[PDB]
Design a protein around this ligand. Structure first.
Ligand SMILES: Clc1ccc(C(c2ccc(Cl)cc2)[n+]2ccn(C[C@H](OCc3ccc(Cl)cc3Cl)c3ccc(Cl)cc3Cl)c2)cc1
Ligand SMILES: [Ca+2]
Ligand SMILES: [Ca+2]
Ligand SMILES: [Ca+2]
Ligand SMILES: [Ca+2]
Length: 145
């Protein structure tokens, strides 16, 4: 089938979270910044190894079609569940088990991202299956699939 404009917009927003300077490519330095904000501490060589798996043309960076190719592979690492829980803990800064729009705003400002209130509210709505206005652990996990 064909992607909708909403699906293209969602892929574009996800790419922009890594592409901090907006030049259309994701570098090892930009990938490292995101991973550190989600509780990880990869070395530069490990970041290069991760990019190399996705980088098809071999120019050291990830472009939009390479990013989409990555998503279409449904690839996973051995400690995926631990990394997803670690990332979940980062967002839920008040320890109540729900990620609020305020807590998502906190992680985005720490990452150096500039997002409007409508963009933050749409990200919550995108993941909020039960409709309580916040993202619980199961919704945060389901979002990854
Ligand atoms: Cl905790 C977690 C688990 C899985 C993923 C997915 C994924 C899904 C959607 C999107 Cl928009 C980007 C990546 N996934 C697919 C491939 N890589 C490998 C790597 O994941 C790095 C990573 C690991 C752990 C954590 Cl906590 C965050 C990240 Cl970004 C990676 C991610 C983004 C780019 Cl641009 C390039 C690479 Cl190689 C991860 C992401 C986070
Ligand atoms: Ca970039
Ligand atoms: Ca490339
Ligand atoms: Ca919370
Ligand atoms: Ca919810």
């Amino acid at each position: 089938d064909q992607l909708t404009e909403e699906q293209i917009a969602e892929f574009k927003e996800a790419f922009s979270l890594f592409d901090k300077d907006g030049d259309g490519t994701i570098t090892t330095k930009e990938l490292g910044t995101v991973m550190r904000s989600l509780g990880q501490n990869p070395t530069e060589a490990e970041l290069q190894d991760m990019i190399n798996e996705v980088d098809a043309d071999g120019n050291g960076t990830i472009d939009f079609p390479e990013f989409l190719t990555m998503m279409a592979r449904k690839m996973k690492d051995t400690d995926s569940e631990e990394e997803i829980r670690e990332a979940f803990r980062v967002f839920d800064k008040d320890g109540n088990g729900y990620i609020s729009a305020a807590e998502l705003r906190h992680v985005m400002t720490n990452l150096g991202e500039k997002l409007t209130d409508e963009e933050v509210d749409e990200m919550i709505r995108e993941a909020d299956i039960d409709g309580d206005g916040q993202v619980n652990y199961e919704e945060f996990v389901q979002m990854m699939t």
